[PDB]
Scaffold this active site. Structure first.
Site, PDB file in Angstrom:
ATOM      1  N   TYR A 159      -0.891  -0.424  11.099  1.00 59.18           N
ATOM      2  CA  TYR A 159      -1.395  -1.130   9.958  1.00 59.18           C
ATOM      3  C   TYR A 159      -0.222  -0.865   8.797  1.00 59.18           C
ATOM      4  O   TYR A 159       0.539  -1.827   8.381  1.00 59.18           O
ATOM      5  CB  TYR A 159      -2.510  -0.835   9.458  1.00 59.18           C
ATOM      6  CG  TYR A 159      -2.775  -1.409   7.829  1.00 59.18           C
ATOM      7  CD1 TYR A 159      -3.139  -2.737   7.892  1.00 59.18           C
ATOM      8  CD2 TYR A 159      -2.725  -0.699   6.863  1.00 59.18           C
ATOM      9  CE1 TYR A 159      -3.510  -3.206   6.597  1.00 59.18           C
ATOM     10  CE2 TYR A 159      -2.967  -1.015   5.533  1.00 59.18           C
ATOM     11  CZ  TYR A 159      -3.241  -2.325   5.233  1.00 59.18           C
ATOM     12  OH  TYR A 159      -3.551  -3.003   4.188  1.00 59.18           O
ATOM     13  N   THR A 207       0.725  -1.109  -0.185  1.00 55.22           N
ATOM     14  CA  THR A 207       0.079   0.027   0.125  1.00 55.22           C
ATOM     15  C   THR A 207       0.951   1.215   0.043  1.00 55.22           C
ATOM     16  O   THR A 207       2.063   1.294   0.526  1.00 55.22           O
ATOM     17  CB  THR A 207      -0.931   0.103   1.139  1.00 55.22           C
ATOM     18  OG1 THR A 207      -1.755   1.387   1.310  1.00 55.22           O
ATOM     19  CG2 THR A 207       0.031  -0.004   2.517  1.00 55.22           C
ATOM     20  N   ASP A 208       0.220   2.498  -0.395  1.00 53.66           N
ATOM     21  CA  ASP A 208       0.924   3.734  -0.361  1.00 53.66           C
ATOM     22  C   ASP A 208       1.251   4.219   1.132  1.00 53.66           C
ATOM     23  O   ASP A 208       1.855   5.233   1.024  1.00 53.66           O
ATOM     24  CB  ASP A 208       0.166   4.774  -1.573  1.00 53.66           C
ATOM     25  CG  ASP A 208      -1.350   5.090  -1.080  1.00 53.66           C
ATOM     26  OD1 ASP A 208      -1.706   4.454  -0.176  1.00 53.66           O
ATOM     27  OD2 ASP A 208      -1.803   5.952  -1.579  1.00 53.66           O
ATOM     28  N   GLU A 209       0.309   3.684   1.829  1.00 50.06           N
ATOM     29  CA  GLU A 209       0.255   4.270   3.252  1.00 50.06           C
ATOM     30  C   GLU A 209       1.592   4.278   3.940  1.00 50.06           C
ATOM     31  O   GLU A 209       2.144   4.577   4.837  1.00 50.06           O
ATOM     32  CB  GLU A 209      -0.798   3.421   4.131  1.00 50.06           C
ATOM     33  CG  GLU A 209      -2.111   3.707   4.019  1.00 50.06           C
ATOM     34  CD  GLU A 209      -3.083   3.305   5.063  1.00 50.06           C
ATOM     35  OE1 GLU A 209      -2.822   3.339   6.064  1.00 50.06           O
ATOM     36  OE2 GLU A 209      -4.090   2.752   4.591  1.00 50.06           O
ATOM     37  N   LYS A 226       2.882  -3.269   7.146  1.00 55.64           N
ATOM     38  CA  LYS A 226       2.840  -3.411   5.652  1.00 55.64           C
ATOM     39  C   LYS A 226       4.151  -3.155   5.074  1.00 55.64           C
ATOM     40  O   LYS A 226       4.686  -3.880   4.163  1.00 55.64           O
ATOM     41  CB  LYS A 226       1.884  -2.683   5.067  1.00 55.64           C
ATOM     42  CG  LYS A 226       0.430  -3.423   4.910  1.00 55.64           C
ATOM     43  CD  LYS A 226       0.729  -4.283   3.735  1.00 55.64           C
ATOM     44  CE  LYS A 226      -0.158  -5.647   3.545  1.00 55.64           C
ATOM     45  NZ  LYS A 226       0.031  -6.405   2.484  1.00 55.64           N
TER      46      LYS A 226
HETATM   47  N1  LIG Z   1      -7.535   0.270  -0.204  1.00 62.13           N
HETATM   48  C1  LIG Z   1      -7.195  -0.885  -0.208  1.00 62.13           C
HETATM   49  O1  LIG Z   1      -8.279  -1.809   0.162  1.00 62.13           O
HETATM   50  C2  LIG Z   1      -5.586  -0.931  -0.419  1.00 62.13           C
HETATM   51  C3  LIG Z   1      -4.980  -0.214  -0.850  1.00 62.13           C
HETATM   52  C4  LIG Z   1      -3.502  -0.480  -0.905  1.00 62.13           C
HETATM   53  C5  LIG Z   1      -3.180  -1.871  -0.575  1.00 62.13           C
HETATM   54  N2  LIG Z   1      -4.066  -3.009  -0.211  1.00 62.13           N
HETATM   55  C6  LIG Z   1      -3.536  -4.338   0.157  1.00 62.13           C
HETATM   56  O2  LIG Z   1      -4.178  -5.240  -0.665  1.00 62.13           O
HETATM   57  C7  LIG Z   1      -4.475  -6.346   0.115  1.00 62.13           C
HETATM   58  C8  LIG Z   1      -5.893  -6.998   0.143  1.00 62.13           C
HETATM   59  O3  LIG Z   1      -6.727  -5.560   0.624  1.00 62.13           O
HETATM   60  P1  LIG Z   1      -8.508  -5.823   0.728  1.00 62.13           P
HETATM   61  O4  LIG Z   1      -9.009  -4.551   1.219  1.00 62.13           O
HETATM   62  O5  LIG Z   1      -8.753  -6.596  -0.800  1.00 62.13           O
HETATM   63  O6  LIG Z   1      -8.514  -6.901   1.729  1.00 62.13           O
HETATM   64  P2  LIG Z   1      -9.628  -7.444   2.607  1.00 62.13           P
HETATM   65  O7  LIG Z   1      -9.202  -7.296   3.893  1.00 62.13           O
HETATM   66  O8  LIG Z   1     -10.845  -7.376   1.905  1.00 62.13           O
HETATM   67  O9  LIG Z   1      -9.240  -9.301   2.418  1.00 62.13           O
HETATM   68  C9  LIG Z   1      -8.459  -9.738   3.347  1.00 62.13           C
HETATM   69  C10 LIG Z   1      -8.634 -11.308   3.177  1.00 62.13           C
HETATM   70  O10 LIG Z   1      -7.526 -11.931   3.540  1.00 62.13           O
HETATM   71  C11 LIG Z   1      -7.706 -12.954   4.439  1.00 62.13           C
HETATM   72  N3  LIG Z   1      -6.950 -13.261   5.397  1.00 62.13           N
HETATM   73  C12 LIG Z   1      -6.683 -12.540   6.522  1.00 62.13           C
HETATM   74  N4  LIG Z   1      -5.769 -12.810   7.180  1.00 62.13           N
HETATM   75  C13 LIG Z   1      -5.196 -14.090   6.770  1.00 62.13           C
HETATM   76  C14 LIG Z   1      -4.482 -15.086   6.801  1.00 62.13           C
HETATM   77  N5  LIG Z   1      -3.587 -14.920   8.275  1.00 62.13           N
HETATM   78  N6  LIG Z   1      -4.065 -16.186   6.029  1.00 62.13           N
HETATM   79  C15 LIG Z   1      -4.796 -16.166   5.010  1.00 62.13           C
HETATM   80  N7  LIG Z   1      -5.927 -15.164   4.712  1.00 62.13           N
HETATM   81  C16 LIG Z   1      -5.914 -14.244   5.418  1.00 62.13           C
HETATM   82  C17 LIG Z   1      -9.039 -12.495   4.815  1.00 62.13           C
HETATM   83  O11 LIG Z   1     -10.013 -13.747   5.214  1.00 62.13           O
HETATM   84  C18 LIG Z   1      -9.847 -11.932   3.767  1.00 62.13           C
HETATM   85  O12 LIG Z   1     -10.453 -12.637   2.918  1.00 62.13           O
HETATM   86  C19 LIG Z   1      -4.030  -6.373   1.550  1.00 62.13           C
HETATM   87  O13 LIG Z   1      -2.598  -6.598   1.585  1.00 62.13           O
HETATM   88  C20 LIG Z   1      -4.000  -4.756   1.579  1.00 62.13           C
HETATM   89  O14 LIG Z   1      -2.725  -4.349   2.331  1.00 62.13           O
HETATM   90  C21 LIG Z   1      -5.388  -2.537  -0.026  1.00 62.13           C
END
Ligand SMILES: NC(=O)c1ccc[n+]([C@@H]2O[C@H](COP(=O)([O-])OP(=O)(O)OC[C@H]3O[C@@H](n4cnc5c(N)ncnc54)[C@H](O)[C@@H]3O)[C@@H](O)[C@H]2O)c1
Ligand SMILES: NC(=O)c1ccc[n+]([C@@H]2O[C@H](COP(=O)([O-])OP(=O)(O)OC[C@H]3O[C@@H](n4cnc5c(N)ncnc54)[C@H](O)[C@@H]3O)[C@@H](O)[C@H]2O)c1
Ligand SMILES: OC[C@H]1O[C@@](CO)(O[C@H]2O[C@H](CO)[C@@H](O)[C@H](O)[C@H]2O)[C@@H](O)[C@@H]1O
Ligand code: NI
Lengths: 311, 310
Positions: free
Chosen positions: B142, B117-119, B146
């Site tokens: 968080y 993430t950009d955070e 990351k």
């Molecule tokens: N705006 C955003 O949502 C955003 C921005 C930048 C980066 N990302 C990154 O993208 C990725 C996914 O984001 P999201 O918002 O789609 O996620 P989300 O929270 O919707 O999905 C998380 C998923 O991971 C699973 N999970 C959690 N712990 C686990 C573990 N120990 N083992 C296996 N699975 C596990 C959960 O069951 C869930 O299905 C993350 O790594 C996040 O850091 C998200």
């Protein structure tokens, strides 16, 4: 007046720190909290083990219940975290730190000094020195684990204003360093009539800080350091590994014919700029490398009982 | 031709990615590996659950034995790691990643795309945009978890040459995002005749990336991305939260009278994705105006999906 919890206090730097504080502050209570892993050694601390202000606790920093208990009981005011490993590598370095931060979060009056390393900045080119604004760029599992704990520690400061300080130092040397480490290895091999190995081409550059100078730096940060900041700590010098060996060779009247080349990866150059410590606390290292190296060599000559069993 | 393990594939981005790959590559096998925590939802993937090339595995990425077994068995060639949490927070985000790196270390033919993430870069001032050389400076637990996984992942590349790539993206929006998240919250509240809250002063700035553009970016990195590198991924835009609400308001013919103020968060995030552009000629296909409209419609048409989660 104060009660200090020193994690990793049975190790090299930790033990030295425990001795330094006890000698420097006659009324402080020092609680050595250590898991006694491979690198932990109670002989490092046997001389002060019966001191009225010293307390030992055998345990992992990941053990929150034990930490809480010790904290409540000893009325702990500061925590200096030396505990670290060199898979449960990350458990200790990252998760152990997180466990300590959570405790501080619950007891926000307790100051935490997270002891880190310059390896966090990665390697330098031919010139330049690390500053507290140098961006993180660790190259190894170890340095990455260390950088992770730093960033996490500072995030706790920015998120909950916990009294957390991070120190980053250069290579320590001095008494109680295991004989695997460069200087002791060179010295103890020389004493045992063995070849003095140089990994690579011997031209890796490092900033050598005497352990007690590191201890005095931490003492200052602990007392006057500003919460949420990083402080680089160094020996104000820079030496190639080969220079270091040549100096050890001369100190023991050996010849260069004893040196031997071997292979390995390792960063090319580390060098710390500690002007922030200087400007803010008027702190500088008390030892020159020439002086430190000599005392260290003598220490090893005089302490075969200590290093023989570890070699 | 390829077999891909998608961790966190029952989540928002993960599920979208699973759908994107299955529709885009008729011969790839997609293995959804997910622990089904609070944010994991099998409904996100129920339409393709019987697809011949889809496989589901319930488990934590910290479970090395299970991972190895799945890898050997499905002849996995790529791992895309979406799994993450938002104390065992670090277990999953840091240690889970380490567990995946160790497995790659043992099976170095397997490429790993660590989704970040950009955070990780912290907040920007009034001007400027993040680049892959922007130093890390996370402000939260968080983001620090990351960043830690990123630095660790790249250290594995520098130390053992493991095929590891790190992607860092801006805020995703789109279908299957939980209704707690800003855009869905605004939309679903509007649909339920509720006040549209704005935390703070509504002037926090974000770069909004449509979830399918994120998926296409990952598809490119996965295939042509250079090992050991970081790739910033963004929507080439920048909006204040209030601008976002106003657009949602006009899209649902509501009035500003529905907005309401409430009350830490970083001030400004904005990504420069010229590296993706120069190296793969990749750009987001969606404009925010377009993406937002389709998203709003999606929420209007899927009360069955968000009602139970709200
Ligand atoms: N705006 C955003 O949502 C955003 C921005 C930048 C980066 N990302 C990154 O993208 C990725 C996914 O984001 P999201 O918002 O789609 O996620 P989300 O929270 O919707 O999905 C998380 C998923 O991971 C699973 N999970 C959690 N712990 C686990 C573990 N120990 N083992 C296996 N699975 C596990 C959960 O069951 C869930 O299905 C993350 O790594 C996040 O850091 C998200
Ligand atoms: N050259 C150097 O020695 C150097 C350089 C820069 C920074 N520092 C840093 O300072 C710290 C101390 O280094 P050191 O050389 O004393 O190492 P060391 O290996 O001598 O110290 C480790 C001590 O901590 C203990 N320990 C290990 N894991 C533990 C755990 N989970 N809980 C409690 N105790 C545990 C060990 O048993 C041992 O007593 C480290 O964080 C290190 O990164 C050292
Ligand atoms: O060897 C087990 C290995 O897998 C992990 C993953 O979380 O834990 C698994 O095994 C545990 C005890 O062996 C079980 O409690 C659990 O069902 C399962 O997740 C790791 O913690 C561990 O390294
Ligand atoms: Ni007790």
């Amino acid at each position: 007046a104060m009660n200090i919890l020193v994690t990793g206090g049975a190790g090299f730097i930790g033990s030295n720190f425990v001795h330094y504080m006890l000698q420097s502050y006659e009324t402080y209570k020092i609680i050595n909290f250590d898991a006694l892993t491979y690198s932990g050694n109670l002989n490092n601390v046997k001389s002060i083990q019966d001191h009225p202000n010293y307390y030992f606790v055998k345990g992992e920093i990941q053990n929150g219940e034990l930490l809480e208990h010790v904290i409540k009981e000893r009325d702990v005011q500061v925590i200096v975290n030396f505990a670290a490993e060199s898979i449960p590598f990350y458990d200790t370095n990252v998760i152990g730190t997180v466990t300590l931060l959570e405790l501080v979060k619950k007891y926000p009056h307790i100051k935490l000094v997270q002891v880190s390393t310059d390896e966090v900045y990665g390697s330098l080119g031919k010139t330049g020195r690390f500053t507290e604004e140098t961006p993180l760029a660790p190259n190894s599992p170890y340095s990455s684990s260390k950088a992770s704990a730093d960033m996490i520690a500072l995030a706790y400061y920015k998120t909950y204003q916990l009294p957390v300080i991070v120190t980053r130092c250069s290579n320590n040397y001095g008494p109680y360093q295991y004989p695997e480490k460069l200087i002791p290895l060179m010295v103890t091999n020389a004493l045992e009539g063995k070849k003095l190995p140089l990994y690579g081409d011997g031209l890796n550059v490092r900033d050598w800080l005497h352990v007690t100078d590191h201890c005095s730096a931490i003492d200052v940060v602990l007392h006057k350091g500003r919460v949420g900041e990083v402080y680089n700590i160094g020996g104000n010098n820079e030496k190639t590994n080969v220079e270091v060996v040549e100096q050890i060779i001369t100190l023991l009247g050996k010849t260069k014919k004893d040196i031997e080349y071997v292979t390995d990866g390792h960063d090319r150059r580390y060098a710390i700029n500690a002007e922030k410590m200087k400007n803010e606390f008027d702190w500088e290292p008390k030892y020159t490398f020439e002086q430190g190296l000599q005392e260290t060599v003598q220490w090893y000559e005089k302490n075969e009982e200590w290093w023989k069993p570890l070699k």
